[PDB]
Amino acid sequence: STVPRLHRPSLQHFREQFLVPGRPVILKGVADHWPAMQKWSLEYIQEIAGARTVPVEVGSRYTDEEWSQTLMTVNEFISKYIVNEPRDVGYLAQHQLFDQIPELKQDISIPDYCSLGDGEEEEITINAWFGPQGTISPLHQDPQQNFLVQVMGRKYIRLYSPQESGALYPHDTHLLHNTSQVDVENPDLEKFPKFAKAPFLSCILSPGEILFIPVKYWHYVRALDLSFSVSFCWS
Ligand SMILES: O=C(O)CNC(=O)C(=O)O
Ligand SMILES: [Mn+2]
């Protein structure tokens, strides 16, 4: 099935129908008037952030044995992994860019829905996810609520309830236990037969849309275009 899309639901409606039961939804009409939606382009990103050092994940998926993490400038990242026919997949993933570069923080807004949480606003973490077409974040689950805001490009996203965890074959080690052993888009059904029948939601997340990923919901993400998303991690 597809993730439902709602236009600016009330706080109460979001709390009662999505946050408390732990059900995904796409919020429309909320982030579409972030300044980022019209300002962020490669040129603007280079102007404001190009000289700054960022961590870059290199490799198809963080579960790959070739995968590694390095450091470079934002200008270098764009040159090597976006604009010039890249040799390998690079991803400026899970980085607190807005703490590093407060000028860019002015182009976004924390969703008012986060105030329904039991945590402090000062404890919300804001992460950038910026990369070329084809980045893949393998199926995993996170320990907080998430609003994933799409600014540039589109992402294909697959969501599996925590009720389906047994069909997702989590890694057995403590370090990887919140990551699935399965490749969502080409699963080894000989090794992982229960995966095939596990129900899920999916969507293509487009610019200006916010996906609510409930705490512990399993998610898999593939960028369909040059993409920039902003996540808000909250409780
Ligand atoms: O956007 C991606 O590639 C992956 N995102 C996440 O896992 C997240 O926001 O928690
Ligand atoms: Mn995640």
Residue numbers in the entry: 182 to 416
Copy text verbatim from the article accompanying this structure deposition.
JMJD5 is a JmjC domain-containing protein, present in both the nucleus and the cytoplasm. Building from an extensive peptide-based screen for potential JMJD5 substrates, our results provide evidence that JMJD5 is a JmjC-hydroxylase, catalysing the stereoselective C-3 hydroxylation of arginyl residues in sequences from proteins involved in chromatin stability (RCCD1) and translation (RPS6). Like most 2OG-oxygenases, the JMJD5 active site contains a metal centre, which is octahedrally coordinated by an HXD..H motif (H321 and D323/βII, H400/βVII), the 2OG oxalyl group and a water molecule, which is likely replaced by a dioxygen during catalysis.
We therefore pursued a site-specific 'disulphide enzyme-substrate cross-linking' strategy, which enabled us to obtain four structures of JMJD5(Q275C).Mn.NOG.RPS6(A138C), JMJD5(N308C).Mn.NOG.RCCD1, JMJD5(N308C).Mn. OG.RCCD1 and JMJD5(W414C).Mn.NOG.RCCD1 as cross-linked complexes (Complexes 2–5, respectively). In these structures, clear electron density was observed for the substrate backbones that enabled modelling of residues other than the target arginine (RPS6 aa 137–138 and RCCD1 aa 139–142). Compared to Complex 1, single sidechain conformations for the target arginine residues corresponding to 'productive' (A in Complex 1) and 'non-productive' (B in Complex 1) orientations were observed in Complexes 3/4 and 2/5, respectively. The non-productive conformation as observed for both RPS6 and RCCD1 in JMJD5 Complexes 1/B, 2 and 5 (but not in ycfD or FIH) may reflect a substrate entry/product release route, though a role in binding one of the other arginine residues present in the substrate sequence at some stage in catalysis cannot be ruled out.
